[PDB]
Amino acid sequence: VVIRSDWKKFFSDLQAEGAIVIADERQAKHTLSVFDQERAAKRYSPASTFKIPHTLFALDADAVRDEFQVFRWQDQDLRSAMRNSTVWVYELFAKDIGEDKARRYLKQIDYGNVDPSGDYWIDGNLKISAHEQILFLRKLYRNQLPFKVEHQRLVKDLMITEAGRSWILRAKTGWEGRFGWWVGWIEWPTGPVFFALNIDTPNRTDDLFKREAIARAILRSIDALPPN
Amino acid sequence: VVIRSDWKKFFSDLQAEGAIVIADERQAKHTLSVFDQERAAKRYSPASTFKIPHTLFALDADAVRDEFQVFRWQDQDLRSAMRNSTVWVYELFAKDIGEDKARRYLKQIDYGNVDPSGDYWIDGNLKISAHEQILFLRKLYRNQLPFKVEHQRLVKDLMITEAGRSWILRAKTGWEGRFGWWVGWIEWPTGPVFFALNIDTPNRTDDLFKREAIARAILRSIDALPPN
């Protein structure tokens, strides 16, 4: 665990309080870098980062079949639902899964708190840490979650925000109101670089841009994003 | 079939002889646009565009397991092999599959000529047309090829050359020596736009850039690529 006092700079440059864990797996030897080890180990409601395991649950439970399936009531497929902030599709999924399957699903994947007591992933008691996001993400990357490999591939395809010839960025934001996240990874020919940042958002919507901004400055600093 | 005399301009702007089929599925009604219907229906050796069905064959036949599997003799995974021009990995796959499984695989997917008589996809008798590329690509997109859905997803993930928030470009070039291709699609929230261009390459390596260049000018002309 490499304690990154060299990365505080990116946080304070934007007046931000947060933590980040990056796991750089591009060399034969893997490092684990951390800013605020303590906050990194703290557990926070995932919010919309939960869309990643939640889609695996919905797919497993056949709450949704396909990338092609349309939900009406403006029509969402699984890709628009992943990419947007409209809440009803995932709320639908939760109702169709129920608290018990969710419960068991959460223990199966060992997702933080594992406890789903409105929406359980923002308004309930479910909580995960930056380190726990990293461990989960890496399992999904290696296709080792207890889900069909096709569902894992699908979800990983839904998470694409950006790509070039050599690299694929697969990532998800979340915001609880008091704090927000950005998690995901970027793949390079030699391997991935996982990231999971949370920060506090005292200035609310005006702080949201700092999620990706801070993480991106850090990733450019270790050559894990292209120049601009 | 909408005959695109409005697209000749992009071909001659680069002194090029070729055809293109685009299938725009972004509206409830699908169109099929074509430049040179006749050459569009003609069959040409796929060359490296064959890497797309060939990877499905290798995966099915467990010639390769995984995105993670490494081939030695510089080490290739399935992603580097897809992205590069180094020939030995796919030649390996062919030997492990043999002419008979290849044969049956080709008939199963109804891939052009269906006949694998060095490398059969550049030096043999296998041949497919721009229209036949389009039909195959659309099957892969809908997950309706006779292969596990996970293998289809994988191959579709290997084909990513580029992406943004809203769009994913999944594409493959080929060159035979006398002619070259670019095929693939780009996905938008409302649906994909399939493309398959071949052109002659009398000036050899100096003509190769025209494959993507012509197709891209066309796709920008119908708003199916971002501005630049």
Automatic annotation (TrEMBL), chains A, B:
It is an enzyme of class 3 (hydrolase). Residues 19-219 form the Penicillin-binding protein transpeptidase domain. The active site is at S48 (acyl-ester intermediate). The keyword Hydrolase applies. Keywords: Antibiotic resistance, Hydrolase, Signal. It catalyses: a beta-lactam + H2O = a substituted beta-amino acid. The keyword RNA-binding does not apply. The modification N6-carboxylysine is found at K51, K210. Its EC number is 3.5.2.6. Belongs to the class-D beta-lactamase family. This is Beta-lactamase. It comes from Pseudomonas aeruginosa. The lineage of its organism: Bacteria, Pseudomonadati, Pseudomonadota, Gammaproteobacteria, Pseudomonadales. The gene is blaOXA.
